Amino acid sequence: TTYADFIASGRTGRRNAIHD
Amino acid sequence: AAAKKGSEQESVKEFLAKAKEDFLKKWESPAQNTAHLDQFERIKTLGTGSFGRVMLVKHKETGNHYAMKILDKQKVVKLKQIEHTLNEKRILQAVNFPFLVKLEFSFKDNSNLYMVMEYVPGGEMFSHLRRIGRFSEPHARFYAAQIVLTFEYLHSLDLIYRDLKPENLLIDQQGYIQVTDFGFAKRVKGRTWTLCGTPEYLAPEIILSKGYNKAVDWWALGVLIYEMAAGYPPFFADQPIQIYEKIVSGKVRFPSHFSSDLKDLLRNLLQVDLTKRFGNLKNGVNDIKNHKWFATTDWIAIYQRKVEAPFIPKFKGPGDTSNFDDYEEEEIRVSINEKCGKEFSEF
Ligand SMILES: O=S(=O)(NCCNC/C=C/c1ccc(Br)cc1)c1cccc2cnccc12
């Protein structure tokens, strides 16, 4: 499932803004 | 409906003209140096970023709690965020809206810049969203309506916000949204070019170096609504480059549980073509406010905070932080030498 793919991904934690 | 210029539209217009008068006065003469670090007792870190942290503090003279953002001037300089930091403070001190966190004080010392804002004890939407999984459509609609009105306000002041995401939305004791993080907010008439924001939320025109305007905030709204209702963003991957390929491809898939009204709204917000993107057309924000998905929304009642929130955060007295994650604490050091004085003279 897409949800399961999301949960297994490395971007379910707080996402940083990109500066440079 | 979306095109119709009824008496309701005039009331909004009237309200916004007065709001612009108030804003411009503070925009042109910013509050400066309105407190000192020693006036505050530092309690606990509530969040961290590249060039500082936000800590829960207690104002000694009143006993009020606040969220104090501490920015290391040298780190700001190294990351080339000087102008963005000046933008952030000048804009936040000048704005006033029920869903915008208030800046109560600001000041600086040899080492750091400080922005003391109201403490919002319910924690980040991000925390609640990840834990619960996803919000119901009526729950997501309630939050989305607040962002719609907030963007209508900000945009009327020629402001672009540029960092919408659940991590920057706090839930107050009434269960209403407070928007924080004005680090990328900018007052611009017409076009701007800085590649900034958060990968999942970037409009295609930003990633394609096109030059862009307030329509990027409407696209970000599409991403936010999708993420709140789905539990995951419409474009995700393990690496940012992969996210960008998805964003520019022009393809989006919706969970099978999305209502057809919700899908239709999101097709119009997550619209690569600017001549077609909702929020960016002749009808402006009204194309959004009058969309079917928002039929049940009473915009004036939302603004007035009269609508019952779908949840109230657990509140265990003043100064409680159990709605926030724990972060490593670091002692605030103030150099004996002034750093970067010229660069931040207006702060
Ligand atoms: O703790 S926060 O920072 N959470 C909102 C954004 N998510 C955390 C990011 C913190 C952060 C700190 C410094 C930098 Br530079 C960048 C991000 C936060 C920021 C501003 C006002 C707040 C009021 N009440 C509670 C929290 C408040």
Residue numbers in the entry:
A (entry chain B): 5 to 24
B (entry chain A): 4 to 350
Relevant lines from the article:
H-89 contains a bromobenzene moiety that apparently binds with multiple conformations in the kinase ATP pocket. Using anomalous dispersion methods, it was possible to resolve these conformations into two distinct binding geometries. However, the anomalous density is not localized to one site but appears spread out into two spheres of density, indicating two main positions of the bromine moiety. Rotation of the C3—N4 bond in the flexible linker of H-89 and adjustment of the following dihedrals placed the bromine moieties of the two conformers into the distinct positions indicated by the anomalous difference map. In the refinement the bromobenzene moieties of H-89 retained their distinct positions in good agreement with the density of the anomalous difference map. Because neither the overall diffraction quality nor the anomalous signal decayed during data collection, the disorder of the bromine does not appear to result from radiation damage and both H-89 conformers are clearly observable. In general, binding flexibility is associated with adaptability to variation in binding sites, consistent with the broad inhibition profile of H-89 for AGC kinases.
Here, an analysis of the binding of the kinase inhibitor H-89 to protein kinase A (PKA) is presented. H-89 was developed and reported to be selective towards the catalytic subunit of cAMP-dependent protein kinase, also known as protein kinase A (PKA). The N-terminal lobe, which is mainly comprised of a five-stranded antiparallel β-sheet, is linked covalently to the C-terminal lobe by a single peptide chain (the hinge). Their interface forms a deep cleft which constitutes the binding pocket for the nucleotide substrate ATP.
